[PDB]
């Protein structure tokens, strides 16, 4: 591991998001910031809010510059409105550099901030094409690269605990690593496999085959990427296109048929509980997603365990049972490889080479009988036809 200063710099959990500490302004104002590969705006609370115990105070920064422009960002979830400006930004446990970046000062929000998440802003790591108001508002990472010698690459190790973290525990626990400008080899086991970034807007990829316990879901591969497939640390669940979700759930139910679960469970709404330590991991199937490789006609697969797709939650009675929610949801906007999927892997966002790498995470949760995997190569034909065109 060659980036010790950035190892273990993340905190949080899949259900509330993973955040990194950052400073804004002069003198520096410390804020916790949501790491989001699914959007492209850097924004921070800048006014009192019931869920914020701190916020960006522009009048206290000598380096604050007002852009005299409003900004509106609607996510799938919530939304916020703010005021554009620029200021000096640093990452304490990151590259030892300070850059001038665009910052949206959040003045109004709805269903955006999360009670108890301990974060006060968001770091959109995707491309300018999806930045608001438009692509002229340079994303933070683009600024970082243009202004310094930091390599145009970052990598994420999101670490799920495999069990519930109470409010005090989640504040003291290491939630992962964001390596800015490199790849730290102590964060994964095995080899890194790369899939092409199809287009530079979201981190878009192409899925070419899906298996549930080795059984081919057998859908036209174009269905898996309808209307796109993205890697998104800012969304908890693995979200699948309506038709794919319906097929996947039918197959996961069939594989786990020795136990009957209520419809509310499969809807990702209600928790299921087992007596302490008795969770029947073995009755649930592994899920394999095959991704386009960098070599013509070649693919590789990433395999996740139910320890990734079943999300640990505290029992509504705080008892001693081990409880979970089904972390796979239907989508109307394409496949979203969310945080619960990223928890099984070390993910390399290699912007410079327009590719995303996957390797088994040194912190993925598993059991003595099964482990997550990244395996290849597989001969796969016509993978370009798996991509959706509007
Ligand atoms: C329930 C609260 C959020 N949450 C738990 C904690 C992560 C989720 O699992 C979740 C669920 C759904 C259905 C959507 C999003 C969602 O919209 N996430 C976005 C980031 C986010 C995190 C939060 F923490 C609260 C929020 F407002 C928002 C992400 O950028 C998402 C936005 C999408 C819409 C978009 C497109 C282009 C540009 C901007 C936004 C595109 C895919 N990425 C997030």
Curated annotation (Swiss-Prot):
Q: What does this protein do?
A: Responsible for the proteolytic processing of the amyloid precursor protein (APP). Cleaves at the N-terminus of the A-beta peptide sequence, between residues 671 and 672 of APP, leads to the generation and extracellular release of beta-cleaved soluble APP, and a corresponding cell-associated C-terminal fragment which is later released by gamma-secretase. Cleaves CHL1.
**Membrane side Extracellular: which residues?**
1-390
Give the source's domain of life in one word. Answer: Eukaryota
| UniProt-annotated location(s) | Cell membrane; Golgi apparatus, trans-Golgi network; Endoplasmic reticulum; Endosome
* Enzyme class (EC, first level): hydrolase
Lineage start: Eukaryota, Metazoa, Chordata, Craniata, Vertebrata
For the Peptidase A1 domain, which residue ranges apply?
A: 18-359
What protein name does the entry list?
A: Beta-secretase 1
EC number assigned by the record: 3.4.23.46
List, in alphabetical order, the Gene Ontology terms for molecular function in this entry.
Answer: amyloid-beta binding; aspartic-type endopeptidase activity; beta-aspartyl-peptidase activity; endopeptidase activity; enzyme binding; peptidase activity; protein serine/threonine kinase binding
First and last residue shown, out of the full length, are 58 to 447 of 501
Q: Per the entry, what modulates this protein's activity?
A: Inhibited by RTN3 and RTN4.
What residues bear carbohydrate chains?
Answer: 96, 115, 166, 297
Q: Which residues carry this modification: N6-acetyllysine?
A: 69, 218, 222, 228, 242-243, 250
Could you say which protein family the record assigns here? Belongs to the peptidase A1 family.
Instruction: Give the GO cellular component terms, alphabetically.
Output: axon; cell surface; dendrite; early endosome; endoplasmic reticulum lumen; endosome; endosome membrane; Golgi apparatus
